[PDB]
Amino acid sequence: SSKLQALFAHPLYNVPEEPPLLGAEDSLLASQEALRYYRRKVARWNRRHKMDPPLQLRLEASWVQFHLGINRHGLYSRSSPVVSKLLQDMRHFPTISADYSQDEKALLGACDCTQIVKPSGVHLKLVLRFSDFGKAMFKPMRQQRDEETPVDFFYFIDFQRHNAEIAAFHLDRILDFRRVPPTVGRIVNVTKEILEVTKNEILQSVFFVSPASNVCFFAKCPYMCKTEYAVCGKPHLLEGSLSAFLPSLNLAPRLSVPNPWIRSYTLAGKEEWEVNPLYCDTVKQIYPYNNSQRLLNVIDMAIFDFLIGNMDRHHYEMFTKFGDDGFLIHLDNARGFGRHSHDEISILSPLSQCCMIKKKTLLHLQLLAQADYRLSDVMRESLLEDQLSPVLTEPHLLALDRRLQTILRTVEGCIVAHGQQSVIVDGP
Amino acid sequence: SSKLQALFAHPLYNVPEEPPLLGAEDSLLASQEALRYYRRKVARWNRRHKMYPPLQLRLEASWVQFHLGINRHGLYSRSSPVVSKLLQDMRHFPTISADYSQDEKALLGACDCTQIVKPSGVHLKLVLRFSDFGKAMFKPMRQQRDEETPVDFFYFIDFQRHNAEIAAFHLDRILDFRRVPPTVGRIVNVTKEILEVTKNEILQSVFFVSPASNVCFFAKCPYMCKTEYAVCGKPHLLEGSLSAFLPSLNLAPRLSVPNPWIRSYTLAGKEEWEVNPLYCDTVKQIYPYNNSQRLLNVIDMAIFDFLIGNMDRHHYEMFTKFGDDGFLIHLDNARGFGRHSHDEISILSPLSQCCMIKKKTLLHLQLLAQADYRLSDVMRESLLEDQLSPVLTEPHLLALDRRLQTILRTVEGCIVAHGQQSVIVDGP
Amino acid sequence: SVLQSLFEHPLYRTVLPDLTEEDTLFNLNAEIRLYPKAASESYPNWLRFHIGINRYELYSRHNPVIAALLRDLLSQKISSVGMKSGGTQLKLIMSFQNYGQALFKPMKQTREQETPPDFFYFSDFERHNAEIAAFHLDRILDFRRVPPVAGRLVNMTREIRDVTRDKKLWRTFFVSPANNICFYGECSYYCSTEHALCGKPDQIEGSLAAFLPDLALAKRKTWRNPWRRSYHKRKKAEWEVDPDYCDEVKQTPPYDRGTRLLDIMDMTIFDFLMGNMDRHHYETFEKFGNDTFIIHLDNGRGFGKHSHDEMSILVPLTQCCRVKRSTYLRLQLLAKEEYKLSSLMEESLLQDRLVPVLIKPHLEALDRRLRLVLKVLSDCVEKDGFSAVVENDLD
Amino acid sequence: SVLQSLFEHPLYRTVLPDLTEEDTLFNLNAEIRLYPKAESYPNWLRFHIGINRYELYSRHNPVIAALLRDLLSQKISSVGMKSGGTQLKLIMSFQNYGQALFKPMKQTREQETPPDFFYFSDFERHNAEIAAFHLDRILDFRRVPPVAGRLVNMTREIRDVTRDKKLWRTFFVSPANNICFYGECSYYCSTEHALCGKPDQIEGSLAAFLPDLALAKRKTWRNPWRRSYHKRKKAEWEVDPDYCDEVKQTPPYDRGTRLLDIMDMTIFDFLMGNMDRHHYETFEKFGNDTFIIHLDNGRGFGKHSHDEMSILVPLTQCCRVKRSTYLRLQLLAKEEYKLSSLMEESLLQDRLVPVLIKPHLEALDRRLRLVLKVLSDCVEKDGFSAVVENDLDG
Ligand SMILES: Nc1ncnc2c1ncn2[C@@H]1O[C@H](COP(=O)(O)OP(=O)(O)OP(=O)(O)O)[C@@H](O)[C@H]1O
Ligand SMILES: Nc1ncnc2c1ncn2[C@@H]1O[C@H](COP(=O)(O)OP(=O)(O)OP(=O)(O)O)[C@@H](O)[C@H]1O
């Protein structure tokens, strides 16, 4: 019984990862410096709201240990008890504050109803704070479970599903990629846990009551352009997805790098890779993809996006401390899991055209194809530990299996054209 | 004294024109047929106006004699006493009716403020009827005398000056082209002679009173788009240009032919002739320009437009009875005479590139360059016979002389490359 | 049979009073002078429709043109298409081979769909279903205050895109990943990519509301409804706090005469039968005076909810409590099983190249909303009495 | 010297009464919470926090002086077109996260509005916006947001720094090889009103941005003397000569501060000739006891050989003014002080001089003496104390 337990007890999910970690220089957050910075922000926070005892910054907090636990090998540890507590905290800890987050806010204005692909700042998302001082990016429910992105919808106008942000985390955990931030689902009292804790005068202005007597709120710019609707509770209850916050950019700077396989983000027109099957022959000769180690990380990201159907991966972020060989952060996955009946093979273009995959990645994929640890069953079980279960409908779960075959078929398919020499990179 | 009398008493303006006219088939209007049709329209007018002594259709009327006097050799006769009466009648006869004219009206709607080059139907022009039953196209005053089309103004947004329609007629008369309809200037009581005689419910609605207590009216579409203003009297008196009406299209059908040298009518982009100096080598091999007689009439039209600076000659109309060799009608010249300091040589592109001019046309141009019959003086005097004198300011008149040199220099200039063989066409 | 019998009733043959040249709108010889020279009663149906607009009705009871005018819109060739400006949602202007024109509201939403409960009245969709349904509803009540509208399956390639010189409308014609053609236009409400109207693959469906005569020779007054919703979240409205509102509004200059008030009553009953709570304005005809009907325009906001009866529309009637006896006897007659509304409405709505224009729940709700209007008249005539609630019209 | 002496008068040192946390606009700590993570705060912030119940800015503030300097020379970060307005007005964003409204040149200095133009057809010109700020400053009203004029480059400061698809698609080059743009507003936003430089400099005014309406809500009141904005059709105040006796019975006009505030404004509008004052905003969080923000002043300074007396009708029908302003208006009529020499002084400190052609500077005194005479011709028919309400007690 329990295919999930068998997966992590497999010799694959237990062998040491090479190269090993010397410490200090392989943990992006320095212990003494980070605790001081978070201690100042607790001091600075305790006033602003004062203008019950004050906040206490404890090392035993979940987000604190999560931030100090980010190493060169990924965001979290393999079968980490820290993340298990972190997920449980974001589900139960009460909220103390709500804001509009950056990425917005810095837009100042800025609504252009003519702009078809308005920037990623005019999207409905908040940043919440809990009693342990930690933060999490809140994405509300925007679609039912048995609902797909309707045909006639381009990728840039696709929705922002909360349940995809959750499932993207579990898939990250099952693949042992360990690159997306932990994410849980939670039912929120939008009045008591969002409105009554926000100090932002704008955010209070977007809360109204429906003719059905429901507490609703909306994104300021999309509501003005009438491109989206509001998000109502029933009448206060609304479910969402909290994604644990990465460390502060003052402690761990990040670098948004544009993907080499961006889309046109237009009603017409295709990019170079969309038309030239020899696109990767050029990519392999451009820095920093000449080291043949950054390209492999993009291949994994392609696999992860194809599994969830995330066409919208224009940029991937990296931690600057880890260098060109550093792993990629798969931050905003809220668009995947929208088409359970369609598989977009253009997402798999990096693997299709470059034709090379990491040794470790291929072994985990082959293993997840066997019925004893098949990808649909281990996901179905892992997602049951969330308050929003079922987070994925049945067509979505089974789709992972079929999309997994397509990945394996492409590997063995283009092995015939290059051999296991140039299609398997068993680097340490 | 009087260089104008010297011009028409010169042997050039007195030699018989070849071929001579046999009659009947060389008068576009058949006498018995035209008199019957015009008599019915007078009968129908007396009925329909009574419902809203009666009119008498006399053969001795100016427009009637003008219409039956249009021959294969032009619109009117050389030094015709009819035209002298026709001009005097349109200046003094009272108005009995005013409408919106066709070309508009058939727009039904039709205001698209996004359209930069809206059709030639959304322009302020009315059709007036006089006591002798004749009609005339009224163009109101839209600019002062000492005012130019300001720089940054494309041709398609240039104004619609009344004094240009008049001066274009006198230049037609002075050149002995005899192709534009007769045009006089007249001061109009816009209340007594337009508003109080219109049966059109829309025309009554566009009349208002200014804060300065002036009777004003406007074009419905351009005022809505705020592209132009209204035209006010002081407070009722307003000057305009009445252009004699051509015969009814039921009696003399016409054929709007597109110019071979149209402009792009866009904020950018050039036509083929604008870039290819060998453009006319193509035109000479396209029907009906292969007979080398229609092309000559287009050359004259270019000369006439260059002298006045009328860039907006997209279409030229022809009488279908006269065939491919028939003369061209220079109908709407309201745009010329706007730049007295600038000469637009692109208008002269037909003569520049084709390099051939009619024998008769060249002799009249050469004659008009000599001080005894110079073009500015004979125009200045001929324009004195108009109530709107001075219809052309001094810089405009002197410009005609200078632009004439450019035409003559162009003839002799490209004569050196082709000789008097292919640059003078002394057809009969 | 039912519709045949309804017009055969003695409550539907009441002729209008005599007329007078002062009761005509404009002298026919003056509208034909506004149109081009063109290319005894062989005038197009849209013209016979215009000259028939008199002081009382907008069209005779059983006109042969109003029937034929609907047929023209169904099948006449589209000449030019242009986008209107300044309106709430997207509405296109059609011009036909016979110089007639009409307003066009597209599909926008399906039949079995309901307006979300969390949508304000000023967020509801304008649907072609309502426009067509309103005309037959108004015709069935013998009000004759709506312009005739008929539904048509239009081709978005040859009847929309390829016959418009509108730079704004045309630049939004894109092809979707489902290989369907879509366009959204450039209005203000739901005019963006994410609300694009698409066919499968190139037929879109919509309604053609006939064009009222040109405002130049038929100026239309525009009056503000005293029960106009505040059109603002949170902020309430006057009629939502004073239960005696009507006792103050029956003192205003134009509502203590007429015909008026009664006209509003005939309208607020209409809007309640549809659920159209977007009635903030009612136009008139100026050249007539304060003694005419109200043109029921922009009906596209009705028929959005079939499981819900928005009682707020009835408040004009519950506060004023008076109706036209002509309409009271009709509304009673339209609730009987031999006549009724559903069987009368599905009859006439069946004669349109768009049936079923109304899913069955809406047709049956018509009887449900009608009996509530009938009951509000009953519950109030016991508190104010007859003769003081019903005003005699016939004799 | 002239300006030096004016602020040295004892009529310009009258401090406001004391304040209270209820008279501040918002807790500064809550406006820094609306902007990104980024008294060393930028000048546009010191300007925002200083907006109290009475003045919009202190008399001789060191920031209001420097705030004008920032708009003159600070780097343009983002440019966006505003929607819903009458004419074209652009939103500018700067390197210091500050923003401002921008109205371009549109018309020259020596030009006059055609006599046949309705009040709702006049141009909105940068001349009026900049002049209105100094005019209001000279009268010590301090009800206008600071505005400064700038020679902007339409290539690097307009076209190449906007992601607005509507605004950019109108940038064409004219037959004079000049760069032009018109935008997509509603009045004079077409090719035939295109704004062009010679060859690529356009000129305009930068009106500082009032604080965000989220934490500084602004009421919007309808002027009781608002013109009908419709040809032929007259207006109420143009037929009842006792209109003011009915408008001083309305709920908010038989208290205040109000009526008097309108008077301080209607005198302002007459000095400029701005007959487009149909709305006057407030600040909501204060109540019915505050000043009126004099916004959208671009329609003034259109006619110098003409004095539009229709603007004065609020004063000729109400006949009452604030004693503070009456003594000032008299003081601003003496040859040692006066308006022209005081107005060309401060207007000389702008990278746009001459912002006002000399006829307008001189007409300023002519409109002032008619206002002063209307006060005199009426104080003889209603008497002092019932025409002037003492406010200077303190
Ligand atoms: N799980 C996540 N999903 C999506 N985005 C994330 C996630 N975690 C972090 N981010 C992004 O990282 C950014 C964090 O920067 P932010 O402005 O919050 O700095 P900070 O950590 O708050 O610094 P300080 O401690 O100085 O306030 C956010 O704007 C957010 O968009
Ligand atoms: N002098 C002129 N300048 C410019 N356009 C002219 C001139 N004379 C006539 N036209 C054009 O010729 C057309 C005349 O056709 P119109 O519709 O007037 O028919 P009609 O001659 O009145 O025939 P009917 O007698 O049947 O009414 C008009 O559209 C007008 O634009």
From TrEMBL, chain D:
So where's the catalytic machinery, residue-wise?
D276
Q: Which residues form the FAM20 C-terminal domain?
A: 171-387
* Localisation: Golgi apparatus
**Which positions does UniProt annotate for Mn(2+) binding?**
E124, D296
Task: State a single Gene Ontology molecular function.
Answer: ATP binding
Q: Which cysteine pairs are covalently linked by disulfides here?
A: C180-C196, C185-C189
Query: What GO cellular component is one of the record's annotations?
Result: Golgi apparatus
Coiled-coil positions: none
Cofactors demanded by this protein: Mn(2+)
- Listed name of the protein: FAM20C golgi-associated secretory pathway kinase a
Q: Which organism is it from?
A: Danio rerio
- What lineage does UniProt assign to this protein's organism? Eukaryota, Metazoa, Chordata, Craniata, Vertebrata
